[PDB]
Amino acid sequence: YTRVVWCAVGPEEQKKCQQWSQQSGQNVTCATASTTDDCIVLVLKGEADALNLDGGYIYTAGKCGLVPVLAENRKSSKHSSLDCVLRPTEGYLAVAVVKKANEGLTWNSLKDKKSCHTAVDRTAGWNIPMGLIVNQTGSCAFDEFFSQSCAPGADPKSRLCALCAGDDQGLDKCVPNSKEKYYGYTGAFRCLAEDVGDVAFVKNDTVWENTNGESTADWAKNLKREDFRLLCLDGTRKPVTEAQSCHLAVAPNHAVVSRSDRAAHVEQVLLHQQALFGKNGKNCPDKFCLFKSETKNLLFNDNTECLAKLGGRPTYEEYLGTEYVTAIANLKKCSLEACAF
């Protein structure tokens, strides 16, 4: 029964998984794929059991019958009395971020600028900002709004990939895994920090975690919060301290998904794995920490306090919420109810 196959996206997640596999005594083992979509296909086939997905991929997976099992829960200020595992999730803030020094760039002058996105099909990097831009321009030509972008997972020959860098060697340009230099929350924010793009579409937490010495990475060493501004939907620009009043949307947390018939068994194993390797785990500082990987967000986001039970045993639609799923569907009309595989 009780062995789980985790699906890793790309070589760096594979290496973290192998460490996790070793430390867990083979209670968890690892399958690897090059994209999140390929990982979803392995799960459907029964060749892997589970992986942690962004809200946008939970929508893809959900249509194919996969179900949310546990959600990432980060440290909050309210609901404090309750344990992390039983605490309701709060969601994260999708923001658009620019350099202070890039004056007079607001939400209404984004057209023909250079953009940095986490990956195609992701909540804060794609679904929210592009959904808003389609609604606002009344056009599905979102591939023509920005002059140049890095949007991992789009056509490498297109302008949506012009700004992506690939790996050390310039290989794998625009692949939607951490081999691409500008992939993910951290990568899209690096794309901005290095002045490759004019705007990054990330979440509030990314700015804080990579500025003011919170990251020791070479590119983030000297970044100061005051050098950045959030774009609000009313045309204003605000300090990064003002995210609660200047965000594009609130996003549902990343969540572990699995096949419906495997859900209960994945849940049981993961709850025990976190008692051992989670934030306060028997073995975390010492042997291995599940929620660490030097700001790279491998398998799980680094700011994760725990994986939390869901409560209300929600479907993927209830988990994502009616607001979010209607945004995705309206945007999906640009690029029809059924599994994409």
Ligand X SMILES: *[C@@H]1O[C@H](CO)[C@@H](O[C@@H]2O[C@H](CO)[C@@H](O[C@@H]3O[C@H](CO[C@@H]4O[C@H](CO)[C@@H](O)[C@H](O)[C@@H]4O)[C@@H](O[C@H]4O[C@H](CO)[C@@H](O)[C@H](O)[C@@H]4O)[C@H](O)[C@@H]3O)[C@H](O)[C@H]2NC(C)=O)[C@H](O)[C@H]1NC(C)=O
Ligand Y SMILES: OC[C@H]1O[C@@H](O[C@H]2[C@H](O)[C@@H](O)[C@H](O)O[C@@H]2CO)[C@H](O)[C@@H](O)[C@@H]1O
Ligand Z SMILES: *[C@@H]1O[C@H](CO)[C@@H](O[C@@H]2O[C@H](CO)[C@@H](O[C@@H]3O[C@H](CO)[C@@H](O[C@@H]4O[C@H](CO)[C@@H](O[C@H]5O[C@H](CO)[C@@H](O[C@@H]6O[C@H](CO)[C@@H](O)[C@H](O)[C@@H]6O)[C@H](O)[C@@H]5O)[C@H](O)[C@@H]4O)[C@H](O)[C@@H]3O)[C@H](O)[C@H]2NC(C)=O)[C@H](O)[C@H]1NC(C)=O
Ligand U SMILES: *[C@@H]1O[C@H](CO)[C@@H](O[C@@H]2O[C@H](CO)[C@@H](O)[C@H](O)[C@H]2NC(C)=O)[C@H](O)[C@H]1NC(C)=O
User: Which residues does the annotation place in the binding site for Fe(3+)?
Assistant: 54, 92, 185, 254
Is position 24 an interface residue for ligand U (rule: CB under 6 A)?
A: yes
Site string for ligand X, 320-339 (x = CB under 6 A): --xx--xx--x---------
Binding residues: 54, 92, 118, 122, 124-125, 185, 254
Structure tokens at 69: 């099992």
Q: Which residue, 64, 39, 58, 124, is CA-closest to 319? A: 58
Residue 72 sits at φ, ψ, to 5 deg, of -60, 135
Binding residues for hydrogencarbonate: 118, 122, 124-125
Cβ proximity of 292 and 25 under 8 Å: no
Q: Which residue, 337, 328, 341, is CA-closest to 55? A: 328
* Residue in this structure with the two tokens 């799960």, named with its chain if needed: 43
Of 8, 51, 69, 132, which one interacts with ligand X (CB under 6 A)? 132
The residue number whose beta carbon is nearest to Fe ion equals 54
| Residue 123 contact partner, candidates Fe ion, ligand X, ligand U, none, CB within 5 to 8 A by sort of partner | Fe ion
Q: Which conformational region is residue 158 in: left (phi greater than 0), alpha (psi within -120 to 50 degrees), or beta?
A: beta
Structure tokens at 214: 């919170």
Cα separation, 92 vs 72, whole angstroms:
11
| Residue 54 contact partner, candidates ligand U, Fe ion, ligand Z, none, CB within 5 to 8 A by sort of partner | Fe ion
Give 263 or 328: the residue with its C-beta nearer to ligand U. Answer: 263
| Residue 260 contact partner, candidates Fe ion, ligand X, ligand U, none, CB within 5 to 8 A by sort of partner | none
Q: Which residue, 303, 309, 315, 261, is CA-closest to 278? A: 303
For the CB of residue 107, give the shortest distance to ligand X in the complex, in Å.
Answer: 13
Structure tokens at 57: 């991929």
For the CB of residue 324, give the shortest distance to ligand Y in the complex, in Å.
Answer: 7
Site string for Zn ion, 289-318 (x = CB under 5 A): -----------------------------x
Candidate segments 73-81, 182-190, 278-286, 328-336, binder of ligand Z by CB under 6 A: 73-81
* Residue in this structure with the two tokens 């990330």, named with its chain if needed: 202
Is position 305 an interface residue for ligand Z (rule: CB under 6 A)?
A: no
For the CB of residue 274, give the shortest distance to ligand X in the complex, in Å.
Answer: 33
Is position 27 an interface residue for ligand U (rule: CB under 6 A)?
A: yes
Residues 260-299 that bind ligand U (CB under 6 A): 272, 276
Cα separation, 259 vs 65, whole angstroms:
7
Q: Is 95 helix (H, G, I), strand (E, B) or coil?
A: strand
For the CB of residue 12, give the shortest distance to ligand X in the complex, in Å.
Answer: 31
Candidate segments 19-27, 45-53, 131-139, 297-305, binder of ligand U by CB under 6 A: 19-27
Cα separation, 106 vs 237, whole angstroms:
7
For the CB of residue 322, give the shortest distance to ligand Y in the complex, in Å.
Answer: 3
Residue 211 sits at φ, ψ, to 5 deg, of -135, 160
Q: Do the bridges between strand 28-33 and strand 237-238 make them parallel or antiparallel, or are there none, so unpaired? A: unpaired
Is position 75 an interface residue for ligand Z (rule: CB under 6 A)?
A: yes
Interface with ligand Y (CB under 6 A): 318, 321-323
